[PDB]
Amino acid sequence: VFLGFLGAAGSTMGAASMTLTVQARNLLSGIVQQLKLTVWGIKQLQARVLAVERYLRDQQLLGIWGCSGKLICCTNVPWNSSWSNRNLSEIWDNMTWLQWDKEISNYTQIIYGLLEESQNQQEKNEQDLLALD
Amino acid sequence: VFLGFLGAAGSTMGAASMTLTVQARNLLSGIVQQLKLTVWGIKQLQARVLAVERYLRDQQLLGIWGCSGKLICCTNVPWNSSWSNRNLSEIWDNMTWLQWDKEISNYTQIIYGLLEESQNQQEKNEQDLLALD
Amino acid sequence: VFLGFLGAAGSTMGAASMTLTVQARNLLSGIVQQLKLTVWGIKQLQARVLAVERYLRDQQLLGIWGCSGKLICCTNVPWNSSWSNRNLSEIWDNMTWLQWDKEISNYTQIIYGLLEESQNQQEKNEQDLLALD
Amino acid sequence: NLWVTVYYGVPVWKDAETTLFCASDAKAYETEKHNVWATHACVPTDPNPQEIHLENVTEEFNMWKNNMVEQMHTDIISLWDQSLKPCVKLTPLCVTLQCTNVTNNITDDMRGELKNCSFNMTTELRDKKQKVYSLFYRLDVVQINNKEYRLINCNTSAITQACPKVSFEPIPIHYCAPAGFAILKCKDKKFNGTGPCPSVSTVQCTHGIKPVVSTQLLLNGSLAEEEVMIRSENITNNAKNILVQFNTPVQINCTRPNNNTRKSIRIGPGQAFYATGDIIGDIRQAHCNVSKATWNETLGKVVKQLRKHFGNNTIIRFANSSGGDLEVTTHSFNCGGEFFYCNTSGLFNSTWISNNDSITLPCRIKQIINMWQRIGQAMYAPPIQGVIRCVSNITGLILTRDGGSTNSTTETFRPGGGDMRDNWRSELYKYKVVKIEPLGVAPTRCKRRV
Amino acid sequence: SLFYRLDVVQINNKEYRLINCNTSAITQACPKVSFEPIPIHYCAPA
Amino acid sequence: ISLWDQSLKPCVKLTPLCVTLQCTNVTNNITDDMRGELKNCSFNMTTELRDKKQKVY
Ligand SMILES: *[C@@H]1O[C@H](CO)[C@@H](O[C@@H]2O[C@H](CO)[C@@H](O[C@@H]3O[C@H](CO[C@H]4O[C@H](CO)[C@@H](O)[C@H](O[C@H]5O[C@H](CO)[C@@H](O)[C@H](O)[C@@H]5O)[C@@H]4O)[C@@H](O)[C@H](O[C@H]4O[C@H](CO)[C@@H](O)[C@H](O)[C@@H]4O[C@H]4O[C@H](CO)[C@@H](O)[C@H](O)[C@@H]4O)[C@@H]3O)[C@H](O)[C@H]2NC(C)=O)[C@H](O)[C@H]1NC(C)=O
Ligand SMILES: *[C@@H]1O[C@H](CO)[C@@H](O[C@@H]2O[C@H](CO)[C@@H](O[C@@H]3O[C@H](CO[C@H]4O[C@H](CO)[C@@H](O)[C@H](O)[C@@H]4O)[C@@H](O)[C@H](O[C@H]4O[C@H](CO)[C@@H](O)[C@H](O)[C@@H]4O)[C@@H]3O)[C@H](O)[C@H]2NC(C)=O)[C@H](O)[C@H]1NC(C)=O
Ligand SMILES: *[C@@H]1O[C@H](CO)[C@@H](O[C@@H]2O[C@H](CO)[C@@H](O[C@@H]3O[C@H](CO)[C@@H](O)[C@H](O)[C@@H]3O)[C@H](O)[C@H]2NC(C)=O)[C@H](O)[C@H]1NC(C)=O
Ligand SMILES: *[C@@H]1O[C@H](CO)[C@@H](O[C@@H]2O[C@H](CO)[C@@H](O[C@@H]3O[C@H](CO)[C@@H](O)[C@H](O)[C@@H]3O)[C@H](O)[C@H]2NC(C)=O)[C@H](O)[C@H]1NC(C)=O
Ligand SMILES: *[C@@H]1O[C@H](CO)[C@@H](O[C@@H]2O[C@H](CO)[C@@H](O[C@@H]3O[C@H](CO)[C@@H](O)[C@H](O)[C@@H]3O)[C@H](O)[C@H]2NC(C)=O)[C@H](O)[C@H]1NC(C)=O
Ligand SMILES: *[C@@H]1O[C@H](CO)[C@@H](O[C@@H]2O[C@H](CO)[C@@H](O[C@@H]3O[C@H](CO)[C@@H](O)[C@H](O)[C@@H]3O)[C@H](O)[C@H]2NC(C)=O)[C@H](O)[C@H]1NC(C)=O
Ligand SMILES: *[C@@H]1O[C@H](CO)[C@@H](O[C@@H]2O[C@H](CO)[C@@H](O[C@@H]3O[C@H](CO)[C@@H](O)[C@H](O)[C@@H]3O)[C@H](O)[C@H]2NC(C)=O)[C@H](O)[C@H]1NC(C)=O
Ligand SMILES: *[C@@H]1O[C@H](CO)[C@@H](O[C@@H]2O[C@H](CO)[C@@H](O[C@@H]3O[C@H](CO)[C@@H](O)[C@H](O)[C@@H]3O)[C@H](O)[C@H]2NC(C)=O)[C@H](O)[C@H]1NC(C)=O
Ligand SMILES: *[C@@H]1O[C@H](CO)[C@@H](O[C@@H]2O[C@H](CO)[C@@H](O)[C@H](O)[C@H]2NC(C)=O)[C@H](O)[C@H]1NC(C)=O
Ligand SMILES: *[C@@H]1O[C@H](CO)[C@@H](O[C@@H]2O[C@H](CO)[C@@H](O)[C@H](O)[C@H]2NC(C)=O)[C@H](O)[C@H]1NC(C)=O
Ligand SMILES: *[C@@H]1O[C@H](CO)[C@@H](O[C@@H]2O[C@H](CO)[C@@H](O)[C@H](O)[C@H]2NC(C)=O)[C@H](O)[C@H]1NC(C)=O
Ligand SMILES: *[C@@H]1O[C@H](CO)[C@@H](O[C@@H]2O[C@H](CO)[C@@H](O)[C@H](O)[C@H]2NC(C)=O)[C@H](O)[C@H]1NC(C)=O
Ligand SMILES: *[C@@H]1O[C@H](CO)[C@@H](O[C@@H]2O[C@H](CO)[C@@H](O)[C@H](O)[C@H]2NC(C)=O)[C@H](O)[C@H]1NC(C)=O
Ligand SMILES: *[C@@H]1O[C@H](CO)[C@@H](O[C@@H]2O[C@H](CO)[C@@H](O)[C@H](O)[C@H]2NC(C)=O)[C@H](O)[C@H]1NC(C)=O
Ligand SMILES: *[C@@H]1O[C@H](CO)[C@@H](O[C@@H]2O[C@H](CO)[C@@H](O)[C@H](O)[C@H]2NC(C)=O)[C@H](O)[C@H]1NC(C)=O
Ligand SMILES: *[C@@H]1O[C@H](CO)[C@@H](O[C@@H]2O[C@H](CO)[C@@H](O)[C@H](O)[C@H]2NC(C)=O)[C@H](O)[C@H]1NC(C)=O
Ligand SMILES: *[C@@H]1O[C@H](CO)[C@@H](O)[C@H](O)[C@H]1NC(C)=O
Ligand SMILES: *[C@@H]1O[C@H](CO)[C@@H](O)[C@H](O)[C@H]1NC(C)=O
C-alpha cells in the first residue's frame, strides 16, 4: 500500500514491514541544488555533506554487519531473551515501531558489538577453510 | 579492446557493452587535490562535493534496484513493448547508445518506478517466507 | 584477539588476517561534529570531504573488482610468480604486512588493471549467455 | 519465538537538531541595498509542496523548547548583516549639526516632528569641504550640554546606510530540511502549544513564512482556526508572554501621506548619501486606521479565551504598556520600506466584567534603527520617495501579566516584549525537526545472538 | 609626480584631478603579481 | 598564525594613534631605580565627532 514517507509510522511494525524503500529514497532528494560566502550557501553545502555523512555512517554499519542485501539479515543462531522479554503478540499485535524503540533504546550499543564481531569472525576464515578443496 | 574514456561512444551498443569500467574509473580522478576563500578554492571543494553527490545519486538508484553487482541485472519477467517498439537489429545492427537515448528519453521516470517497486517488494518478504524452514 | 586499531601492525600477515574490521570502523569516527569562515571550520569540512572521498576511492576500486563481499576475493585462475617470487614461509613465517608492502610497492598499478579487466569482462556476458535458457 | 532481525527503511525518528536551508520562489527584484531581502541566493521551491498526513501518530511538541526558532533567529540576523556589509559606511556623518525647527502648521499639528539641520561634510575631494542640509526626524537627533545636535547612535555605534537595491518586503521563506531529516507539522486545529498533538503530517519543507519584523502585534502572520488560541508554557507564571492568535484578519491601514524628496549628497569618492530633501503634499500625521467594531468584537473573543484560563468569575483589564524603551513601548514594524512606531494606547484601554467609526493610531517615524536590540550596529533606512500606503492584518497578540496581588477577579494585561523570537515561535509552533535513523534492530523469526 | 594627461581631468596653474575619482575608488596593485597571462587549463570535475 | 589573525580581524584599528606625541619623563624614584622605564605622553586625538579634537594623555 502506497503510504509514503514515514507513511507507516502509525502502524504496527509488521505493517511498516513492507514500506521500507520509501524512506530510503528520500536520502538524497535529487535535484536539491542546495556565489560567495552567501548565508544559506555554507548552509547548503554543510547540509549536503551532513546528509551523505549520515548516510554513510549507517551504510558502513551495514557493511560491517555484512549483508548489503538489506532490509533483512537472518542466520540460524538463537537470540538473547534477557533484553526486555516480550511476546510476539506484544510486538506485532500490540506495538508500532515508535513505541518499540522507546523500549529497545538501551541495548543498542550492546547488539551492535556482537552482530559486528560474532558473525563476521565466524563466517570469516571458514571461506579461508573452503578455499582449499 | 582498449578504447578508453567514452572510447566506445562511436560504436553500436553491443560494442560498448564491454568497455563499461573505463568510464567508472574516472568518477574520482584520484590525485585531484582539487588557503583562504581563494577563488578556485571554493570551486575545488564545490566540485568534489558535486562529484561524490552525483556518484551517490546513481549508486543509490542501483542500491534501490537492488543489484550492486552492476553492469547487468536480469530477472525472468517479460518486458513492455509499448515504449517505442523496435527490432533487435534496429538496436544492435542499427543503433549506438547516443541515438538510443534520444528515443528512450521519455520513459525513464516510468521505468525507474516499477524497477524500484516491483522486484524489490516481490523479492521482499519471500526471504521472510523462507526464513521459517 | 582484540588488538585494536592497527593492533596487528606488529604481527605476521596471517595474524592480522583476523582483525580487519577494526580499521574499517575508524573510517567515519561517528560523532565527529567536525559559524563563519572560522579557521578550523573550513578545516573541519575539508577534512570530512577528504575522508569520504578517500573512502569512496577504494570502495570504488572494490566495486570494480566486483566483490563488495570484501576482505576475501578468490577465483580459480593461477597467479603470476614473476613479481618478487617468494616462499609461503617467506610470507607467513617471515613477514608482516609492513615489510610486505615495501616489496610489493612496484606491481600495484599492474595488478589493478588485470583484476579490473579480466574477471569483470569474463564474468560479464556469460550471465548474458545464461540469460537464455 | 522472538529472535533478532535488522531492517533498513524503518520509519522512525528522534528529536534532534540540525541545519535547515532556505527555499524560495523567483521574484528577486527591489530597490533598497542588494536584492529582495537576502533571498535571491535561495534554491527555488518545488512546484508541488508535497505533504502527507500521518494517521495514528501522537508526538509531543514543545513550542517553547524548539530549536528551529534559534537557527532562524541567528540566520535572520546574519542575512541582515550580509545585506549590510557592502554598502556605504556613513561614519563621516557624525558631525556637529546646525539645526532649527521646521515650522509646521501654525500653531502645531506636526509640532515640527522634524528639524532642519545643515552641516559640514567631506566632498569628492579629501579637501575644501561643503555645507549641505537635510531634514531629520527629531526622534533620532540628540542635543549637547542655533543649538548643536548630532545623531543618536553615534556615540555608541557605527551606521551603515542601506543602498537602494534590496527590499524589506518580506518574501515567503521556506525552511527546508536536508536529506535524512523530516519536518513534522501538527495538523490539530486545537493545540495549546505543547504536549501530544494527535493529528500530524510530514512535509519535505515548510510553508512560506513572512519574516516580518514587528512588535506587540503579529502582522501578516498565519491565522488560527475555529478559535483564537492562547499559547504560553506557564500561563500561571506572570513572567512569560501570552501569544494570542486570531481567526479573523483585523485590518489595519497605515500610511505616510507625504511626497518626500530624495536629495543626494556625495560623500565622495563614489559614496552617496540619501537625505530628506523636502516634503510636499498633505502634511498629515503618519498614522493607522482600524475598524473599531471588529477590534472590539474580536478582543471580546479574547476576553472569552483569557477567561477560560482564569475562570468565568473574573474581570480582565487591558492597559497600554507601562513605559520604557521605545522599541517595546510601541507597535514597531516595517512597511513599504519605512519604519513605523505606533503608540497603542488606543488599543488596550479597557477593563472587562465577567459578563464607521474607526480607531486612529498616531505613529512616529524613525530612521537610525537599532535592530534586534543589538548595540554597536545601526542601519540607516533611506528616505523612501513618494507616498506610502500599506495595509495589513493583525493576527495575534503578545501580552504580559502583572497580577497575583489580591488575585481574585481583576487581572490587568499589557502588551510588550521586544524579542522577535516570540514572533518566530508563533509560526513554527506547529513545526518540529526530526532526525531519521533508517537503521533498525527488532525481533522476528530471524535469529542471531551474542 | 608625472601623470599621463589621458587620466587627468580639469575643473570648471590650473587644478586637475584623477578621472575615475568622482565615480569610483582606486586600488593600486602592489608589486608581486604579474599580468603575464599564464596558460590556464579548465578542468572538469569527475 | 591565522588564529591570531582571526582574533585580530574584528577589533579596533588604531590607525589615528600614529600622531606626534608630547612626552616627558615619569620621575620614578630618586635618583633612579626605575630609570623611568616609561614616559608620560599627551597627544591630540580625534573624538566621537569627526570634529574639534581632544587632548588626552
Ligand atoms: C503584509 O503583507 C501585505 C501583503 O500580504 C503587504 O502589503 C504590501 O505592501 C507593500 C507596501 O506598499 C506593497 O508594495 C508596494 O506597493 C507600492 C504601491 O504601488 C501599488 O499601487 C500603485 C497605485 O495603485 C500601483 O500602480 C502599483 O502597481 C504597480 O507597481 C507594482 C510594484 O512596482 C507592480 O508590481 C505592478 O505590476 C504595477 O506595475 C502597486 O499595486 C509600490 O509603489 C511598490 O513598488 C515599489 O516597491 C517594490 C518593492 O518595494 C519595488 O520592487 C518596486 O520596483 C517599486 O520600487 C521602485 O519603484 C518606485 C516607483 O516610484 C520607486 O519610487 C522606488 O524607489 C523603486 O525604485 C510596492 O509594490 C504591496 O503591493 C502590498 N502587497 C500587495 C499584495 O499588494 C504588507 O506590506 C505587509 N505588512 C507590512 C507591515 O509591510
Ligand atoms: C483600508 O482602505 C481600503 C481602501 O480604502 C478599504 O477597503 C475598502 O473597504 C470598504 C469597506 O467594505 C469597501 O467599501 C464597500 O465595498 C463594497 C463592495 O464594493 C462594490 O461596491 C462599490 C460601491 O460602494 C463599487 O465601487 C465597487 O466597484 C464594488 O462593486 C460595497 O458593497 C459597499 O457599499 C455598501 O455599503 C455602503 C456603506 O459604507 C453603502 O453606502 C452602499 O450603498 C452599499 O450598501 C462599500 O462600498 C471598499 O470597496 C474597499 N476598497 C475597495 C477599493 O474596494 C479598507 O476597508 C480599509 N481598512 C481599514 C481598516 O480602514
Ligand atoms: C562648518 O560649519 C560650521 C557651522 O555649521 C562653521 O562654523 C563657523 O566657523 C567659523 C570659522 O571658519 C567661525 O568663525 C569664527 O568666528 C569667531 C567669532 O566671530 C572668530 O573669532 C573666529 O576667528 C572665526 O572667524 C564661525 O563662528 C562658526 N559658526 C558657527 C555657527 O559655529 C564652519 O565654518 C564650517 N566649516 C567649513 C569648512 O565649512
Ligand atoms: C508556573 O509559574 C508558577 C508561578 O507563577 C509556579 O507556581 C509556583 O510553584 C512554586 C513551586 O513549584 C511555589 O513555591 C512554593 O509553593 C508552595 C505551594 O504552592 C507554597 O506553599 C510555598 O510557600 C512556595 O510558594 C510557588 O508558590 C508557586 N506560585 C504560584 C503563583 O503558583 C508553577 O510551578 C510554574 N509551572 C510549573 C509547571 O512549574
Ligand atoms: C533649512 O534652513 C535653511 C536655512 O538655513 C533653508 O535654506 C535656504 O532656504 C531659503 C528659502 O527657504 C533659500 O532662499 C533662496 O536664496 C537665494 C539666494 O539667497 C535667493 O536668490 C532665492 O530667491 C531664495 O530666497 C536658500 O537658498 C536656502 N539656502 C540653502 C543653502 O539651501 C532651507 O530651505 C531649510 N530647509 C527646508 C527643507 O526648508
Ligand atoms: C500614547 O497615547 C496616549 C493617548 O492615547 C498618551 O496618553 C496621554 O498623555 C497625555 C499627557 O501625559 C494625557 O494628558 C493628561 O491630561 C490631564 C487632564 O487634562 C492632565 O491633568 C495631565 O497632566 C495630562 O496632561 C492624556 O490624558 C493621555 N491619554 C490617555 C488616554 O491616557 C500617551 O502619552 C502616548 N504615549 C506614547 C509613548 O505615544
Ligand atoms: C499609557 O497610559 C497611561 C495612562 O494614560 C500613561 O500614563 C500617564 O503618563 C503621563 C505622562 O505621559 C503621566 O503624567 C505624569 O505627570 C507628572 C507631573 O507632571 C510627571 O511628573 C510624571 O513623570 C508623569 O509624566 C501620568 O502620571 C501617567 N498616568 C498613569 C496612570 O500611568 C502612559 O504615558 C501611557 N503610555 C503609552 C505608551 O501610551
Ligand atoms: C595638538 O597638540 C599640539 C601639542 O601636542 C598643539 O600644538 C600647538 O599648536 C598651536 C597652534 O594651535 C601652536 O601655537 C602656535 O604658536 C606659534 C608660536 O607661539 C604661533 O606663531 C602660531 O600662530 C601658533 O599660535 C603651539 O605652538 C603648538 N604647541 C606645540 C607644543 O607644538 C596643537 O594645538 C594641538 N591641536 C589641537 C587641535 O588640539
Ligand atoms: C543474555 O543477556 C544477559 C544480560 O542481558 C547476559 O548476562 C551477562 O552474563 C555475563 C557473564 O556472566 C555477565 O558478565 C554480565 O554482567 C551479564 N549481563 C548483565 C546485564 O548483567 C547473558 O550472558 C546473555 N546470554 C549469553 C548466552 O551470554
Ligand atoms: C505497457 O505500457 C502501456 C503504455 O505504454 C500501458 O498502458 C497503460 O494502461 C493503463 C491501464 O489501463 C492506463 O491507465 C495507462 O494510461 C496506459 N498507458 C498509457 C501511456 O496510456 C500498459 O499497461 C503496459 N503494460 C502493462 C501490462 O501494464
Ligand atoms: C608474468 O609477468 C611477467 C613479467 O612480470 C610477464 O612478462 C611480460 O611478457 C610480455 C609479453 O611478452 C612482455 O611484453 C612484457 O615486457 C613482460 N614483462 C616484463 C616486465 O618485461 C608475463 O607475461 C606474465 N605472465 C603472463 C602469462 O602474461
Ligand atoms: C496543553 O494542553 C493540555 C490539554 O491538551 C492542557 O491541559 C492538560 O490537562 C491534563 C489533564 O487532562 C494535564 O495532565 C496536563 O498537565 C495539562 N497540560 C499542561 C501543559 O499542563 C494544558 O492547559 C495546555 N497547556 C497550556 C499551557 O495551556
Ligand atoms: C464558565 O461559566 C459556567 C457557568 O457560568 C461554569 O459552569 C461550567 O459551564 C460549562 C459550560 O460551558 C460546563 O461545561 C461546565 O461543566 C460547568 N462547570 C461548572 C463547575 O459549573 C464554568 O465553571 C465557567 N468556567 C470557568 C473556567 O470559570
Ligand atoms: C480610555 O479610557 C478612558 C476611560 O474609559 C476614556 O475616558 C477618558 O479618561 C480620561 C482620564 O483622565 C479623561 O481625561 C478623558 O476626558 C476621558 N475621555 C473623554 C472622551 O472624556 C478614554 O476616552 C479612553 N481613550 C482611549 C484612547 O481609549
Ligand atoms: C489577511 O489574510 C487574509 C487571509 O484570508 C488575506 O485574504 C486573502 O484575500 C485575497 C483577496 O481578497 C483572497 O484571494 C485570498 O484567498 C485570501 N486569503 C485566503 C486564505 O483566503 C488578506 O489578503 C490578508 N490581509 C491583507 C491586507 O492582505
Ligand atoms: C629624562 O630622561 C632622560 C633619560 O636618560 C634623562 O637623560 C638625560 O640625557 C641628557 C642628554 O642630553 C644628559 O645630558 C643628562 O645627563 C641625562 N640625565 C640624567 C639624569 O642622566 C633626562 O635627564 C631626564 N630629564 C629629566 C628632567 O628628568
Ligand atoms: C532503559 O534504561 C533506562 C535508564 O534508566 C530505564 O529507565 C528504562 O526503564 C530502560 N528500559 C528498558 C526497556 O530496559
Ligand atoms: C465593545 O462591545 C461591548 C458589547 O459588545 C461593549 O460592552 C463595550 O463597551 C464595547 N467597547 C467599547 C470600547 O465601548
Numbering used by the authors:
A (entry chain J), B (entry chain F), C (entry chain B): 518 to 551, 566 to 664
D (entry chain I): 33 to 141, 150 to 185, 188 to 309, 312 to 321, 321A, 322 to 398, 411 to 505
E (entry chain E): 174 to 185, 188 to 221
F (entry chain A): 109 to 141, 150 to 173
Give verbatim lines from the article.
Here, we detail the functional development of a V3/glycan-specific bnAb QA013.2 isolated approximately 6 years post initial infection from a HIV superinfected woman in Mombasa, Kenya. This bnAb binds the V3 glycan at site N332, with a footprint similar to that of the bnAb PGT128. The QA013.2 bnAb has previously been shown to potently neutralize tier two viruses from clades A, B, and C, as well as several tier three viruses from clades B and C, but it did not neutralize clade D or A/D recombinant viruses. The mature bnAb is only capable of neutralizing viruses that contain N301, N332, and the linear GDIR motif.
A 4.15 Å cryo-EM structure of QA013.2 bound to native-like trimer showed recognition of V3 signatures (N301/N332 and GDIR). A cryo-EM structure of the mature Fab bound to heterologous HIV Env trimer reveals that QA013.2 evolved to establish a conformational epitope that spans V3, with the majority of the antigen contacts mediated by the antibody’s heavy chain, with additional contributions from residues in the light chain framework (FWR) and CDR loops. From the cryo-EM structure, it is apparent that QA013.2 interacts not only with the N332 glycan as previously reported, but also with the glycan at site N301, and the linear GDIR motif at the base of the V3 loop. Key regions of the antibody paratope include the CDRH1 and CDRH2 which are nearest the N301 glycan, as well as CDRH3 and CDRL3, which are in close proximity to the N332 glycan. We observe that the CDR loops of the heavy chain contain many polar and charged residues, which likely facilitate hydrogen bonding interaction with the Env glycans and the charged residues in the GDIR motif. The CDRH3 loop is distinctively long (21 residues) and appears to tilt away from the rest of the heavy chain toward the light chain, generating a cleft between CDRH2 and CDRH3 and exposing an extended interface that has been observed for other V3/glycan-specific bnAbs including 10–1074 and PGT121. Seven key residues in the Fab CDRH3 loop (L103 – I109) lie adjacent to the conserved GDIR motif. The structural data also suggest that the N301 glycan is playing a major role in facilitating antibody neutralization, based on its location adjacent to FWRH1-CDRH1 residues in the antibody VH region that we show are critical for bnAb breadth. While the V1 loop of Env does not appear to be in direct contact with QA013.2 Fab in the complex structure, the backbone Cα atoms of the Fab CDRH3 loop and Env V1 loop are within 8 Å of each other, suggesting there could be amino acid side-chain interactions between the two loops that can affect neutralization. However, unlike many other V3/glycan-specific bnAbs reported in the literature, this bnAb emerging from HIV superinfection relies on residues that span FWRH1 and CDRH1 to achieve cross-clade Tier two heterologous neutralization, while residues in CDRH3 are less impactful.
